[PDB]
């Protein structure tokens, strides 16, 4: 939620950048027409947030379903640039069981928390890789004691799972 909150301010400043830039003193009617194709988009961002609100994976997936729901329209880049940075910290967690194996948790945003030794309870993104990540980590933790095409994630990932 912080990153998504940190991604939003990366946008408002642009909205503050566009204003106070072009018009020194223009016609009154020019203001209403100029800020129409952009103003209505600002009111759309109120439907997205509250002005409750999910957190963790529940939010990283809720924002995803807002893409396909309104894909081809002019709201594709702005939502994408949010999702592209609202998932930045979550990849790092995923970037643990794949490279280092040191599970990192703070408040439970991860879908997975922590003789038999296999009691790391587990139970949107393609489930074809969901269950695989759960086992791709426990192996490392065991050796230590001895269009929406998601290709930018699985491609640098599946190459390391088989090895």
């Amino acid at each position: 939620f912080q990153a998504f909150t940190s991604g939003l301010r990366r946008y408002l400043q642009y909205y503050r950048a566009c204003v106070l830039s072009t018009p020194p003193t223009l016609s009154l009617l020019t203001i209403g027409f100029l800020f129409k194709k952009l103003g209505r988009q600002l009111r759309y961002l109120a439907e997205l947030c509250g002005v409750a609100f999910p957190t963790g994976v529940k939010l990283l997936s809720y924002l995803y379903q807002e893409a396909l729901h309104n894909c081809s329209n002019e709201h594709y880049p702005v939502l994408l640039s949010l999702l592209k940075t609202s998932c930045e910290p979550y990849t790092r967690f995923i970037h643990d069981w794949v490279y280092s194996g040191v599970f990192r948790d703070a408040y439970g945003e991860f879908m997975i928390q922590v003789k038999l030794y296999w009691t790391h309870g587990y139970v949107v993104f393609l489930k074809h890789i969901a269950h695989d990540i759960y086992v791709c980590g426990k192996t490392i933790n065991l050796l230590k004691l001895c269009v929406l095409m998601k290709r930018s994630i699985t491609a640098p990932l599946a190459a390391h799972i088989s090895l």
């Binding site: 990153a3 940190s6 991604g7 940075t85 930045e88």
Partner: protein, 137 residues
């Protein structure tokens, strides 16, 4: 580099091209950089850091800005420069046994049958060598 950004304005103002409303735009980056250096110079004054603890702070004040990219390319220039002198004695303690450290700041201090000669000091650990605080000694 801030004494130049005020030199370019004292020359561009002679020609009359610098209205007050125009100033409030040009200094926007120099108002954000001088607001990081005035926050590290505050923690150091308030909390006595010298040696390692003044290098732990510059590894946490650089992780808190893990999404700014305009105040992380800065705090990564300070840490990368305020740690060469600390890392030039470390290259004398790993590749050889001599510890110069005139000011008592290094993580390892010697003494005058061998578990008391060299002792790890707990304060002066950079908190990014904490994982290998033992293999160094």
């Amino acid at each position: 580099e801030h004494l130049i950004l005020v030199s370019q304005l004292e020359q561009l103002h002679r020609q009359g091209l610098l209205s007050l409303q125009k100033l409030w735009f040009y200094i926007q980056p120099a108002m954000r950089t001088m607001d990081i250096l005035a926050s590290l110079a505050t923690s150091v004054d308030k909390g006595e850091c010298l040696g390692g603890s003044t290098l732990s702070l510059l590894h946490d004040r650089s992780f808190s800005y893990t999404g700014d990219s305009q105040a992380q390319e800065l705090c990564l220039y300070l840490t990368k420069a305020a740690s060469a002198p600390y890392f030039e004695v470390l290259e004398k303690w790993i590749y050889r046994g001599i510890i110069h450290d005139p000011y008592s700041e290094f993580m390892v201090e010697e003494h005058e049958y061998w578990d008391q000669r060299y002792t790890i000091v707990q304060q002066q650990i950079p908190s990014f060598l904490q994982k290998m605080a033992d293999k160094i000694l």
